[PDB]
Design a protein that fits this description.
This is part of a larger assembly, with chains A (about 270 residues), B (about 50 residues), C (about 200 residues), D (about 160 residues) and E (about 170 residues). With about 270 residues, chain A is an alpha+beta fold. Chain A contains 10 helices and 6 strands, in the order αααβββαβαββααααα. In chain A, the strands form 2 sheets. In chain A, strands 3-2-1-4 form a 4-stranded mixed β-sheet, with helices on both faces. In chain A, strands 5-6 form a two-stranded antiparallel ribbon. By secondary structure, chain B is mostly helical. Chain B is elongated, with a radius of gyration of 23 Å. Chain E has about 170 residues and is an alpha+beta fold. Helices cover about 20% and strands about 20% of the residues of chain E. Classes of the chains: A alpha+beta (about 270), B mainly alpha (about 50), C alpha+beta (about 200), D alpha+beta (about 160), E alpha+beta (about 170). The interface of A and D includes residues 13, 24 and 26 of A. The structure holds 3 RNA strands.
Chain lengths: ~270, ~50, ~200, ~160, ~170
Amino acid sequence: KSSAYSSRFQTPFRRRREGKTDYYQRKRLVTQHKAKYNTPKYRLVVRFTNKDIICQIISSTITGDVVLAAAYSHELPRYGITHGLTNWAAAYATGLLIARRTLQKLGLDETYKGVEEVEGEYELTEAVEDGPRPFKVFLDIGLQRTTTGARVFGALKGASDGGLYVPHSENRFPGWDFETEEIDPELLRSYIFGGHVSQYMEELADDDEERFSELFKGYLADDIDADSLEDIYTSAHEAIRADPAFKPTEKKFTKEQYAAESKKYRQTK
Amino acid sequence: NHTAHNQTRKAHRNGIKKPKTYKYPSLKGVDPKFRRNHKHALHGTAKALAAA
Amino acid sequence: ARRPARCYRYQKNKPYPKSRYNRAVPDSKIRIYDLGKKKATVDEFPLCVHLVSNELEQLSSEALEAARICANKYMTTVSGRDAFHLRVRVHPFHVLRINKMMRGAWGKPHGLAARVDIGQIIFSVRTKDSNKDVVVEGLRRARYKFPGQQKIILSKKWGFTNLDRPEYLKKREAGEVKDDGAFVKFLSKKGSLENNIREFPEYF
Amino acid sequence: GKSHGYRSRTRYMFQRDFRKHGAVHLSTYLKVYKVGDIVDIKANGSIQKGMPHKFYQGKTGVVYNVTKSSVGVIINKMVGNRYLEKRLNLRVEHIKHSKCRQEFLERVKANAAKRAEAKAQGVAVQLKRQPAQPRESRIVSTEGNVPQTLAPVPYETFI
Amino acid sequence: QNPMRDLKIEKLVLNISVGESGDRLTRASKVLEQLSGQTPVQSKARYTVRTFGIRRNEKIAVHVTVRGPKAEEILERGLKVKEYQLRDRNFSATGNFGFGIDEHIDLGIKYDPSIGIFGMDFYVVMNRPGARVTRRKRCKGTVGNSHKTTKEDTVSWFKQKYDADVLDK
RNA sequence: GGUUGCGGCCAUAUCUACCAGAAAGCACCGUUUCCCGUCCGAUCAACUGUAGUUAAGCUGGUAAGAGCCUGACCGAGUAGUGUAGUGGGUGACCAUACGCGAAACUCAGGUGCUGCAAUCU
RNA sequence: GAGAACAGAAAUCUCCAGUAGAACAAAAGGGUAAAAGCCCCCUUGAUUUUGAUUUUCAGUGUGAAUACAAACCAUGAAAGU
RNA sequence: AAGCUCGUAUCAGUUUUAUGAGGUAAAGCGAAUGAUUAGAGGUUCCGGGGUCGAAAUGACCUUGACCUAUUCUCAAACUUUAAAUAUGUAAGAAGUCCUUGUUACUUAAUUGAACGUGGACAUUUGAAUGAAGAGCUUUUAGUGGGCCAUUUUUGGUAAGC
């Protein structure tokens, strides 16, 4: 193009060129009642890549955001989940994980236990009587389009069942009836564990057997049938109560051997 | 029709006076939500300093 | 009817050009601004004689016309139409108001004018070195028409260009110069190499 | 007739700086504001809700209130032969802290710290500022820089 | 050569413009149901003129998009309606093309009496895999010059497939 | 050092034309049983990461490139301007004294820096 | 701009570019691009109580606006508005 | 005019340092929006002609537009940029630091917020000059036709307009 176009062009912000943010929404989340002067405004950031889930507790400062705690789907094998890592179930598990991580990184894991026996009900985390208040965070789904049944409201549910008071309304959880404006909790509890995957597996296991294995080639490794997912995911839910703390990997190198190779691939000037 | 000659001279004769700012200004335009708690705070401070 | 030009001479008011705010304006009497061998290269006519001002006044679109005519009727009739290139620099855009009638003393446009400052070219004549005695006289018969002290100048620049004679020859001896219809295209030492070499292949 | 409105004569005044249209950068809603703070005013025509009047453009004032999405400032205004206090409520996009105080407070820190230092040293110091005093004596060398004589230049050969 | 570089088709649009509205458009809409299995969409008008007698918000044209192997099938049975002969002018810049036909029963449909004869436009578009990025919400972007379909690649693919007749006139 | 998520400053980051990219990662690519959404599982939702791949995307380079940023013995202490005179000039305008002082051209250089967490031969 | 039968300068359809050159009830200016513009869904904050403040301004009114408090509501998954 | 409270405070038609706002002059238009002269290199299935032509989505002259780099000159109601003068604010005692008491506001919170106690700093008490005293109140007279000059400047041809 010509020069008059470029010399009077305006570059949008870097992350709006990259497409990874919405400032019209960030201005609504980050900003706070000024009489609440320097207090933070905590967001449950949640993102669904092609094969991994990210969850984060994010505060906002001037020179970038600040991460209190975060969770990724690729450590759930520490508790027992090995396949179906981008799932409504894995989202609920990771929400419970991040919640139970933060609620002892702050020191409230005893007062607010959340719900220990899920039944798929819309229940908001109340405050204790004459004690600390729940951890009040909010939620921002990226550029995602909210639709009922989404993978992300599973994480919302796991969070609120962990205890950290994410306000929400049931009309985007699945099993909500547009007609009568009510919810079916049993369908929701089915989707918590394997209800949209186990049913499909035990459908194809007598409809089309070869294709069932072509897709679920991994669920036949340790001999997981399409009924053990309940006792698997609840054992995950309980181990997360047992030991939600983050314990990082062990590195084969020390951040200089890592850099030495890329320093002879990066194609300097 | 609006000959504004000799107005600044009249102004500067008797002086252009600043408003004489005070300590403890008026709390009329402030947040009532804060005003009430400030009120209830000062009485507690007075009760705490009467004994002490 | 017309006013005398000794009324609208000096830069008194601020300029009031033609636009949507001032749409209906009578058109100028000068329309031509270029005469002689227009389609003639910079190589033919090296020498440039200007006609500079010495005051700050207004020039009328009919004065420019009757000066151009009496400067072109001499050169063309004594040397030849293809001997020179004459260019009028200034253009009349200012507009002049008249109270043809003080309740509602606004004025209706009837003429145009050209704003000049202390040091400003009006006429620029491009010729060879063997035609300056004619050029100077042809501009002498023009300084009589429009008012003021106007001094004729013999430039150091080549033609209507910006470079002096020997600097321009330095540039021409290499491939740093290409011709246009009647102007030039200098070769920068910056830009896209491929396009820079496509044109000006005599260089390098 | 003549018009005296609320945004008259604000054509070149409230239009954004060139190549700065669009959303406001988030560091406007995160620079926190307390009472007693001192601020300047610059209004942006992208946020029509919370504007000042054109008289309060470029002015400077002190804060006296803090609410959601907005603050309130005290500004002294000339009219007739006295100054009137004006308590006006603005949003935060139209506000920037004034560095006149953030450059003063560091000098407070510096002179306080050096009054604590000299009070440990055993010296009596000066910490009032002073203007640019005149230049002192010096000896100017001629070892490499011999003076180059000069003369003015004529009119001809320049023209 | 390369997987995810072949000029795979993505969709085909069966546009029909009539010029007027009424039962005519419904008889233009009860025809594509069998030819596609999907409902058409009735396109609304845009401007005004006396020659064609149209006004805004009026339905004069109808079309349907179709993807998957159904577009391939329909094009295979609709190109021997043309004897597989296509002209270079029918190929656009970006390597997508199309063509008109007049007899909408030339495909072999069980002729409905109540509709008659009206033609049918086709315009098929293709794109090498990985063109999602121009459509998705998060992290949009364009595709490189090494990945853009053109007349050159499309006539190659259309000579390699369909076994002949691209009239390079 | 590379990468992801969230980002701050918002072109030194953009734009055009090519080239290269181990590692993981990101991404594309596989299927529609389910919530859901579309005229069109194209987008969007969900499922497996299982089947294939860097060609795109993405990152990094290259261009005596366009554009942008920085800077001065470039232009220029010029144009303009506050003050002064029983200064000049028919006047327009101009000069000088005290002071401030640009822009455009020109030339040279630069072509993202970084913040929290996680991860990579 | 390149393309598709009837189809043209133009009806409908598809692709590339596209910093606004469009539209925003109304004059002009300003402002606005995952919106303040187009389409759709839900809606009545176009509501009650009185106050504080800005503008023209004697710092009187009237008109129009700005930011809060006590209530009730909508809308949104939510911050929020 | 009457005075009242006070006694060099903290004010000032002032400068300096620091820190902000403007869109006037100037400059620019081979940068946007408009106005504008010139020829050159170009493009047509597409503005009109002439020629070869049965006719061509056919060839050559030709002329305007669109394309491209160039060129002459402008804008009070165009502008990337952007001065001079004038203008807003701060330069401490009603201050700084430490300690930590109150509350029905606020915080995930013994969180910050506002106001505080008790300590330390009080001498160059935090730029210059000067200060014929600073502050405050009441009451009322006359006026409420203006004019001349330097500079800026609008109508007007111009005026002791």
